[PDB]
Design a protein around this nucleic acid. Structure first.
Lengths: 181, 173
DNA sequence: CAGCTCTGTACATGAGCAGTGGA
DNA sequence: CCACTGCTCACGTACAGAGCTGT
């Protein structure tokens, strides 16, 4: 439906909630703007150039970053996904993760890790803070990290700059992980 | 792409630019809920009860109205449309109207009728104003009427007038 | 008056657009 | 041709609000 953009030996995999309608129409990841993703990617220095969506399949392999979603199926969204839907998708997400074994699995949007901790970990997770989360992806060495959804809808972070901290921090975490290798 | 709803013997056909992404996904016409099109319909008394998009199929039946777009293919917005595609599209639009022959063909927006005019008719209009345009659809008796783009109460008037117009046309017999 | 599960609500910037009216 | 008023949606997320348990 909207194909993942995942390969092996990836530093970073970015996990999106469900693909939006624009995303489906263009068949490319995070093509909004206002989807803060691509701006943050540049600003954080994860990318040294400005990259629209169309550059998405050039990110594994040059940059180490892959795309996938927690729910494959198109939705407006995100308020319209069944609770069942999510936890059903948690299942298949994991399988990919353990198949592909990226260093860090970044969850885009808070709502998805909340459910993942429930369903995968069985942990309810009081007062979920962004960033590095203690539990490793089962049977892998992949670390989970949480970000605010890079969607303009998210009024508690207005601008891409507001979100950029998390992108930097992530890049930092990657860098460290590289050092212990 | 999003199918039209056209029947023969139609009082009113609503013509839009081209179906938006949501419109496609939901598979109904003017889902909104920030198109105003359904409220405006009701307030005017073209509908007796607040309808929603899920009722679009009933409309040529129960309510005498149908729907089409100038361009058929779904678009995010108007940027993505090309001049040639409006020209191709607007070409197709006449043919449907020629076939179906509704009383009044209603254009949603000023934008779109301006296009249709200068391609279909060959006049370009200086100072377009809403309401009934002097010209009829080629080889039909079908009239053209322009409506603000439905995308609330402040424009209800145009609907009300449209219903009134509809009534006169029937009314003559 | 704290302690959690559950259900829905106004929230902030900004791109995009329709319509008027400009320099 | 842009520059303006004003008003949607945008891959959500932080709240106060209602219902119960308990030292």
């Amino acid at each position: 439906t909207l194909p993942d953009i995942l390969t092996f030996n990836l530093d970073i995999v970015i996990i999106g909630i469900a693909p939006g309608l624009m995303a489906a129409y263009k068949g490319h990841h995070y093509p909004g703007p206002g989807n803060h993703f691509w701006k943050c990617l540049f600003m954080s220095g994860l990318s040294e150039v400005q990259l629209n969506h169309m550059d998405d399949h050039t990110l594994p392999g040059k940059y180490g970053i892959g795309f996938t979603n927690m729910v494959e199926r198109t939705t407006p969204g995100s308020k319209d996904l069944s609770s069942k839907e999510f936890r059903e998708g948690g299942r298949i997400l994991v399988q990919k993760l353990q198949k592909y074994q990226p260093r860090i699995a970044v969850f885009n949007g808070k709502c998805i890790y909340e459910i993942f901790s429930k369903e995968v970990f069985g942990v309810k997770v009081k007062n979920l803070e962004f960033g590095l989360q203690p539990h490793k992806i089962p049977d892998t060495e992949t670390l989970c990290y949480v970000m605010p959804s890079s969607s303009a809808r998210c009024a508690q972070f207005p601008r891409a700059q507001d979100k950029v901290h998390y992108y930097i921090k992530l890049k930092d975490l990657r860098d460290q992980l590289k050092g212990i290798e």
